[PDB]
């Protein structure tokens, strides 16, 4: 409904709709991720080497071929898993038979 | 240096704590109050925490 | 003493159970129905719980 002859003072930086939108987006984000698989069993050292595929000049060291001993469906078993991680997702670590670990662990 | 009133009230307890990595363990020492320590016989360890 | 219609219906299964202490295990056994477990191939074990 257009309001003819109605002048209203606005202030976009004092608008509480922004604060509500912010809180609603964060809350929905957390609600979405809460009932999901946690990766705490993967906070182990990784044995990482250079990717053996053809690497362009700008991808040298960006992506690494990492391997680790992950848990399985059963508590008493382990499996060796190979995966490619971006350098940004791993950090150097000194260990016996490993080179890197996940940045957030 | 422990006075007579505090004999047996504190113990220097060694244990293998978990750490950031799932398959690593961190050997640590801590001082616990006697009221928080309950005896166990075991073979290597001497006590466990009262609520475990 | 198992009757003719119960042969293989119930199994006596042993396993390494956890305990109230993280660094100790208890060897236990229990009777499971065949419908609760499925065959598994391993060095020391031969069944797992059907839903795991």
């Amino acid at each position: 409904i257009h309001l003819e002859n109605v002048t209203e003072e606005f202030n976009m930086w004092k608008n509480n709709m922004v604060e509500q939108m912010h809180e609603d987006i964060i809350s929905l984000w957390d609600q979405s991720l809460k009932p999901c698989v946690k990766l705490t069993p993967l906070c182990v050292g990784l044995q990482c080497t250079n990717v053996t595929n053809n690497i362009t000049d700008d991808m040298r060291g960006e992506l690494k071929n990492c391997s680790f001993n992950a848990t399985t469906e059963l508590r008493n078993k382990r499996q060796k898993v190979y995966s490619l991680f971006y350098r940004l997702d791993i950090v150097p670590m000194v260990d016996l038979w490993t080179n890197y670990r996940l940045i957030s662990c | 240096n422990i006075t007579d009133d505090m004999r047996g009230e504190l113990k220097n307890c060694s244990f293998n704590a978990t750490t950031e990595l799932r398959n690593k363990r961190q050997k640590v020492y801590s001082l616990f109050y006697r009221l928080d320590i309950v005896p166990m016989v075991d073979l290597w360890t001497n006590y466990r925490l009262i609520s475990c | 003493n198992i009757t003719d219609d119960m042969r293989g219906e119930l199994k006596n299964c042993s396993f390494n159970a956890t305990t109230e202490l993280r660094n100790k295990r208890q060897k236990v056994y229990s009777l499971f129905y065949r419908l609760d477990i499925v065959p598994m191939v391993d060095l020391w074990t031969n069944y797992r719980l059907i839903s795991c």
Epitope: V94, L96 | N23 | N23, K24
Partner: antibody, heavy 132, light 113 residues
Framework: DVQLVESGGGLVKPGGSLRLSCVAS????????MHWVRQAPGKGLEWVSV????????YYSDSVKGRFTISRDNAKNSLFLQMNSLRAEDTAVYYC?????????????????????????WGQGVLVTVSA | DIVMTQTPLSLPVTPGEPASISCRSS????????????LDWYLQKPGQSPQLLIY???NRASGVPDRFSGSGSDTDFTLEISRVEAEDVGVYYC?????????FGPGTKLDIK
């Protein structure tokens, strides 16, 4: 009384192959890391390679990758090193050593413990000569 | 990428007097996971396989006389012997032990004047 005795050395022509065997006694073989180190005549010590207790994790020095393969048999309490495509630069006395103590704590969710002691006990040494 | 060097390649010492063998790493050998520095010292007597003298920067190996003592910073290390006898001379090697790819330095010859 920790003992390590190497055998299987001798003279091999360049391009051939030779397998050394280190027999250990006095300790549980499956509990310790095993290392090979070599010393060329007139040179200092050169680290060659290490094999884990299970044999699942193997690492070689860059100078010996490809040409050397390390393996072990815990039931027989012995360590093997298979050399291929030997070069004149590979003439050396080879030694096997015991590494640190590695333990898998089964009760503690198969946790890993390791105590390092350097290269600990060293063997007698076996000479491999590459020449023709 | 990590190498070891030793300045005193020839260090004759009067028997019965103290001596020390220095060693430098091209990179820090400190392990940030536990704060320990991993560096071993070995001695190869003529005609014998090398034996372990010191494990880690300052931990003496069992069976080693108490006269041998290691010390050092993350990159600058010294092995000191309070008195050197004929039984304590031969070729010394500095071995890095932080990263798994272990290497040895050029070594030094300790002898008797």
């Amino acid at each position: 009384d920790v003992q390590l005795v190497e055998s299987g050395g001798g003279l091999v022509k360049p391009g051939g192959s030779l397998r050394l065997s280190c027999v250990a006694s006095g300790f549980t073989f499956s509990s310790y890391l095993m290392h090979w180190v070599r010393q060329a005549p007139g040179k200092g010590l050169e680290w060659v390679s290490v094999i884990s207790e299970s044999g699942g994790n193997i690492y070689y020095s860059d100078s010996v990758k490809g040409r050397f393969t390390i393996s072990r048999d815990n039931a027989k309490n012995s360590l093997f090193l298979q050399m291929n495509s030997l070069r004149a630069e590979d003439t050396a006395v080879y030694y096997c050593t015991r590494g640190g103590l590695f333990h898998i704590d089964y009760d503690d969710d198969y946790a890993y413990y390791y105590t390092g002691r350097g290269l600990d006990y060293w063997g007698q040494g076996v000479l491999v000569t590459v020449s023709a | 990428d990590i190498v070891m060097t030793q300045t005193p390649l020839s260090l004759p010492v009067t028997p019965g007097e103290p001596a020390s063998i220095s060693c430098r790493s091209s990179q820090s050998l400190l392990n940030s996971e536990d704060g320990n520095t991993y560096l071993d010292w070995y001695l190869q007597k003529p005609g014998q396989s090398p034996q372990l003298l010191i494990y880690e920067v300052s931990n003496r190996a069992s069976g080693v006389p108490d006269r041998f003592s290691g010390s050092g910073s993350d990159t600058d290390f010294t092995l000191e012997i309070s008195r050197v006898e004929a039984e304590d001379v031969g070729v010394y090697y500095c071995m890095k032990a932080l990263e798994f790819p272990f290497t040895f330095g050029p070594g030094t010859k300790l002898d008797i004047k």
